[PDB]
Amino acid sequence: KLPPRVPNLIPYVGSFVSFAKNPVQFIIDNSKKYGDVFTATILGKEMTFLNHPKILDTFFKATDNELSLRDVYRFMRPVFGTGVVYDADSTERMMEQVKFVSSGLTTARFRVFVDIFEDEIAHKVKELGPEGTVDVAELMADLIIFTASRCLLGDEVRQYLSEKNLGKLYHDIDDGISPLSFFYPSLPAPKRDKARKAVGEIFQELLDKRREEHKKHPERLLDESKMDVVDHLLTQKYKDGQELTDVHRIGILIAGLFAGQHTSSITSSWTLMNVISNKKVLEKVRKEQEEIMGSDKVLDYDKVMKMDYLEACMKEALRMYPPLIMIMRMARKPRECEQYIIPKGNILVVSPSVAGRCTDTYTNPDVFDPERLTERKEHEKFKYGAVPFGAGRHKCIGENFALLQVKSIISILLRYFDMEYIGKIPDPSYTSLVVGPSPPTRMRYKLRK
Ligand SMILES: CC[C@@H](C)n1ncn(-c2ccc(N3CCN(c4ccc(OC[C@H]5CO[C@](Cn6cncn6)(c6ccc(Cl)cc6Cl)O5)cc4)CC3)cc2)c1=O
Ligand code: HEM
């Protein structure tokens, strides 16, 4: 029959109160009370939490007409645009749009991306000076505003960042998104909407400029190392032959930059903080860096590919502090799952955060210990033991890029600076859509040369 329910405090509002304090602890606590599968009413939504790695196969392998992403992420529509990604007309169109982004994240482009990271950090160290303190979360976000923009949109975007305040507009859009929007998509957000329109106009100009550049240098279209997401969007069609609209192109770019920015800056923050706060971990990270760099003075893709330990540090941060704490679908048909049938209309929930603390999987899960991965391989105990990037048909297409951007940034910063964190590593703050550390996050830095 139906899964057990978390008793409602009120009707309607149901369990929103305990949930919103800490959605992660909410799931953990109620797992203990009611088991692997339970349902809670939250601001009117029937939400069925799947809480053990063992049972996640049917979630991640279901087709979109059984478990819909579009029904649950559609709320993003005012940020991304009408008709884009989870507001696409069909599952099929969404997948095609996702592929246009993934198509600018090729190995050829990755080699160029490393140079971009070097370039932006070099600009940034001018601001920072020989020593000081800086907010880690801001520093990463500020770096990734410039790096992700150039990576995805091309270098032509940088003059907008430097001269037309594009970075501020991103913030206006992105602080205009409340996690509550998940429940009340219609929440007015007029500042967000003004900024989104401004970025829209700028990205329209970027497209128009690229068009005529594709006139004066069609060779660009033949060079895989110079082809970015703007170029792919300007030269592709859907499979059935239908052309893209510039409105669609703008929305896809914005969606891509969104995805491309937060989850990464938050991960780089938690990673750097944990690395510089643990002497043994920092020693190993630096030993690895010194061996890989050899006599070489800057980064390249091949070097980054060898940074196995640093990559484990990032994965360990993702186990502990995955920035998307909930993965969701709406059931369009009833769904079995253990003894239970989950009713049509329920929202199924999987939590990367819960998974990362599960004890069937990880020993002392509150400790940041990259060696649980490299040596004890604890993640491999279950097929879905670690799902920071999701899994199955909708698994994150930006992974390897994430890994690249975060590893590069951390590696370059280490090369530049000795760094120590000020205070305890914070707790996560559940106030935002993408979850990051509670401010403030400060660190002391000093130049190494
Ligand atoms: C705020 C105070 C108090 C009232 N409160 N306290 C806590 N909460 C709360 C928190 C969180 C949540 N939620 C609901 C929203 N949520 C969430 C919803 C959708 C979602 O979508 C994942 C999809 C959609 O966007 C992306 C994100 N992404 C992928 N890679 C990097 N980011 C995505 C995929 C593709 C593209 Cl192109 C763009 C985007 Cl953004 O994947 C992620 C999280 C987290 C839990 C609800 C309430 C509160 O309301
Ligand atoms: C550490 C950084 C990142 C984390 C933790 C992360 C996490 C995720 C997760 C969990 C999903 C699955 C969502 C779901 O199935 O409901 C996902 C999907 C996706 N991610 Fe990421 N992501 C990261 C970086 C990126 C980057 C950098 C991009 C683009 C540049 C990106 C683009 C996407 C896209 C397009 C999807 C949708 C796949 C689909 O629906 O088919 N992500 N991501």
Q: Which CA distances in Å does 283 have to 221, 273, 277, 420? A: 44, 14, 11, 13
Q: Using CA positions, which residue lies closest to atom 10 of ligand 1?
A: 179
Which of 388, 369, 389 lies closest to 278 in space, CA to CA?
Answer: 369
CA of 371 to the centre of ligand 2 (A): 25
Max CA separation in the chain (angstroms): 67
Residue 445 near residue 134, CB atoms below 8 Å: yes
- Residues in the chain, how many? 449
CA–centroid distance, residue 254 to ligand 2 (Å) = 14
> What is the CATH classification number for the domain harbouring 297?
1.10.630.10
- Measuring CA to CA, how many Å separate 346 from each of 210, 391, 394, 407, 429? 45, 21, 19, 38, 27
The helix (H) or strand (E) run that includes residue 181 is none
- Structurally, the chain folds into a number of domains equal to 1
Is 50 marked as binding a ligand?
Answer: yes
Q: 171: number of CA atoms within 13 Å, CB side?
A: 11
3-state secondary structure of 396: coil
Pocket of ligand 2 (CB under 6 A): 69, 98, 101, 256, 259-260, 263-264, 267, 322-324, 327, 388-390, 394, 396-398, 401-402
**Cα–Cα distance measured from residue 76 to residue 205, given in angstroms and rounded to the nearest whole number:** 24
Q: Please indicate if the annotation marks 73 as binding a ligand.
A: yes
Nearest to 135 by CA among 423, 434, 430, 448: 423
- The residue nearest atom 31 of ligand 1, judged by CA position, is 259
Q: Which atom, in ligand 1's list, is nearest to the CA of 256?
A: 37
Q: Solving technique for this entry?
A: X-ray
Q: Which residues span the domain enclosing 349?
A: 1-449
**Residue from 6, 20, 44, 11 nearest 326 by CA:** 20
CA-to-CA dists, residue 124 to 100, 242, 319, angstroms: 30, 43, 29
Ligand 2 atom at minimum distance from 260 CA: 27
Q: How far is the C-alpha of 140 from the C-alpha of 443, rounded, in Å?
A: 12
**CB neighbour list of residue 241: distance below 8 Å, 6 or more residues apart:** none
- Ligand 2 mean position, distance from CA 339 (Å): 31
Resolution in units of Å: 2.6
Residues 114 and 300: their CA atoms lie apart, in Å, by 6
Q: Which amino acid is at 321?
A: Y
- For 152, residues 6+ apart whose C-beta sits below 8 A from its C-beta are 101, 104, 228, 229, 230, 253, 256, 257, 260
Question: In this structure, how many other beta carbons lie within 10 angstroms of the beta carbon of residue 181?
Answer: 19
Cα–Cα dist 136/117, whole Å: 17
Query: Tell me, what amino acid is at 116?
Result: I
Distance CA(168)–CA(212), nearest Å, equals 28
